[PDB]
Amino acid sequence: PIEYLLFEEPTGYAVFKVKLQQDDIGSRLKEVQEQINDFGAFTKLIELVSFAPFKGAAEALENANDISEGLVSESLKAILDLNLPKAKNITLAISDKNLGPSIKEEFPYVDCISNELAQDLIRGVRLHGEKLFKGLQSGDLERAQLGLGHAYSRAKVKFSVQKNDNHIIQAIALLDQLDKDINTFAMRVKEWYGWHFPELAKLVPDNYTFAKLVLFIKDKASLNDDSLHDLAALLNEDSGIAQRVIDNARISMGQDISETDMENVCVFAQRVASLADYRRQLYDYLCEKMHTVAPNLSELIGEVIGARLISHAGSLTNLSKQAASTVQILGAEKALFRKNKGRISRYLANKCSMASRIDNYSEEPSNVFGSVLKKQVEQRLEFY
């Protein structure tokens, strides 16, 4: 007595019309069951009659929920209204019994079915999937299922980017990478310009300064009192390097390199300057995120140190998980926490573990507890 079948897709809602009714008495016969597997037989039973794809990602989740709590969405109401005739009562087959009463309320003239016969067809519809859509645009169900999957899940758990801490792990890995590469290039700039003016590399040991100074002094021959004041403005004259570079540039040993060579020194020196500037920018980005992600842990030990501990555990969830002893050895390879000295390290390790659990497991952690815990550590520090 079934005529219409309601099915739901991640892309949208699909309605089917039952052309032929399978034998109900012999439902459990192998021969009827084999037909459900067989596409050719199944197409004789039903035919796809409607499909209305969801407008976007947001609608699918809203309907995905509304199906979950056994509710009818506006989208579902529109489709059923257009397809189901008013009619004694048209019979609709549905997977969920809970959706039954909801459908009956909105449409008094429809009778829902969720018996094994309905389940048997619903299984066949889901078995063949897009093959029954007869070329209609239903995208790819497997990916759309993936599209809705965590989307449905994270919603119930109320997952948010705020709890996300991977940004910290990426930042630390990048920051150390930047520091190594800034150093490696800056040395090459020293070698490159060292040929043209070796003494200057000795004068300004600070590599970042040296790149800036080389950018101004591209040619050591160019020496003017005004230029001396300019390079004097760079850093300070307390070291006296401003006078030394003028005197050294006058009497220095470096063989003059080509204009193309000097072009690259400043260009390469420009590259080192940008990375250090970005590294400073990323360092600040790390600093604020800890105050947002782990206000307690950062406030106890520090933003950078706390980040390194989290990276060692692999996630803030991992760090909160480990026992106090494990946390102590977690940063025992770089002396993050560092006989009386060892006692404080063990003491601090517990309070670091004390805090990590607070931050991870609080949706919006505060720093009120982090402050007092450090004050507790400070009292211990004075006592020992």
Partner: peptide
């Protein structure tokens, strides 16, 4: 059979249908 061309609800399902029919009763 259900047809889009003739309204099958017998009451205005969409809030638009509420607003328009109000004028039609009002107009004449």
């Amino acid at each position: 059979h259900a047809s889009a061309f003739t309204r099958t609800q017998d009451v205005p399902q969409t809030e638009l249908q509420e607003k328009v029919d109000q004028v039609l009763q009002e107009s004449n």
